[PDB]
Design a protein around this ligand. Structure first.
Ligand code: UDP
Length: 358
């Protein structure tokens, strides 16, 4: 009988991370005839939506002490007490600060367990990166995160790259018929610059040679700026806006039907699930080679392309070649190119990364 604690600061209760965590917990609580999972949250308030925890046993440390030294002390004490009630074999920290908490509460509680980091954002784009050193071993969702962890003096031997899961699909979205315009897809929150750089998307497409259309599924405060920019660039007649969609891939299947490539032009990403989703439907992806995720998914010339951050010329080149057919991606084999990301194999590799360190 083995018990796994998943711990972190309170989250919103909606987000890719929550979805991954709940699925990994439900999967564990079946695995070996249910080996048990619980959660512990460090909270300043009870504003976390609880829906995603419906079937998940969780406890909380509440402290809104304004001085962080005292709040952390209180957190560590509360977690220490929980550890004594619960006696987990393994503690997995979904953020970096919780590695510190887990480490200090292990010393305080006198309990024996292994601490794993499992961060869901680039260490260099979030607050408490140096707290990663308090975990025993590391579960990297990307090569970039592994690199970031190594940079803090952690041995590559103590870090397993586990990626993130996606569901196997039984439908392929085919390319457009020959002599139809290229069809580009953008799926995500709209930011003109900042993280998403829709500006870069528009600048590239405006410079491309050949017939193309762009389908944009998403919304954000920069909608009007982005529409204005498309008008400025003289491309508005080739852009179709869907706004926010609850079922983007249903819209793709039912309304768009044929896709040349999904495009992502981001300055950075926590984990670009959109790329994975696209490749699960056999859609090739042209992405900025940003921290982090795209380089672990995209195999240049096989399921899409990578361009160096800011290399808009390179992006344009990638576009031109897929529009002309100079480079062709085979939609029928693209789903097989992300084998290690599919739910069952992902979980197998994740499970082995944990139990191999014991
Ligand atoms: O109109 C949309 C646009 C995006 N997404 C989903 O949002 C996720 C990532 O989008 P985003 O760029 O917002 O990343 P985040 O900021 O949420 O990390 C993906 O799983 C998409 O399928 C969606 O459901 N509807």
């Amino acid at each position: 009988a083995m018990k796994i604690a998943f711990i972190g600061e309170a989250v919103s209760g909606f987000g890719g991370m929550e979805t991954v965590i709940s699925n990994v917990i439900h999967t564990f609580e079946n695995s070996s005839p249910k080996i048990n999972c619980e959660m512990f949250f460090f909270c300043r308030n009870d504003k976390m939506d609880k829906a995603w925890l419906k079937e998940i046993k969780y406890a909380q440390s509440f402290s809104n002490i304004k001085l962080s030294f005292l709040r952390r002390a209180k957190h560590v004490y509360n977690f220490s007490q929980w550890l004594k009630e619960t006696s987990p074999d393994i503690v997995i920290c979904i953020d970096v600060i919780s590695c510190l908490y887990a480490n200090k509460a292990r010393k305080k509680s006198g309990k024996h367990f292994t601490i794993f980091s499992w961060p869901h954002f680039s260490l260099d784009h979030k607050k408490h990166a140096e707290c990663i050193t308090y975990a025993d071993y590391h579960l990297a969702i990307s090569s970039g995160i592994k690199e970031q962890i190594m940079a803090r003096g952690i041995s590559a031997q103590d870090i397993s790259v586990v990626y993130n899961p996606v569901s196997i699909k039984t439908v392929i979205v085919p390319p457009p018929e020959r002599d139809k315009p290229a069809v580009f897809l953008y799926v995500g929150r709209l930011k003109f610059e900042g993280q998403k750089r829709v500006k870069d998307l528009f600048d590239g497409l405006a410079r491309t040679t050949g017939e193309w259309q762009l389908h944009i599924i998403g919304d954000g405060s920069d909608f009007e700026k982005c529409q204005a920019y498309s008008r400025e660039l003289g491309i508005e007649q080739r852009v179709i806006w869907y706004g926010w969609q609850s079922a983007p891939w249903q819209v793709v299947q039912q309304k768009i039907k044929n896709v040349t490539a999904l495009l992502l032009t981001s300055a950075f990403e926590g984990f670009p699930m959109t790329l994975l989703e696209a490749m699960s439907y056999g859609i090739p992806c042209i992405s900025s080679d940003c921290m982090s995720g795209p380089r672990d998914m995209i195999k240049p010339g096989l399921n899409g392309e990578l361009y160096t951050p800011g290399a808009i010329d390179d992006f344009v080149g990638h576009l031109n070649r897929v529009i002309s057919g100079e480079v062709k991606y085979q939609h029928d084999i693209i789903p097989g190119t992300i084998e290690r990301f599919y739910d069952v194999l992902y979980f197998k590799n994740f499970n082995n990364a944990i139990f191999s360190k014991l």
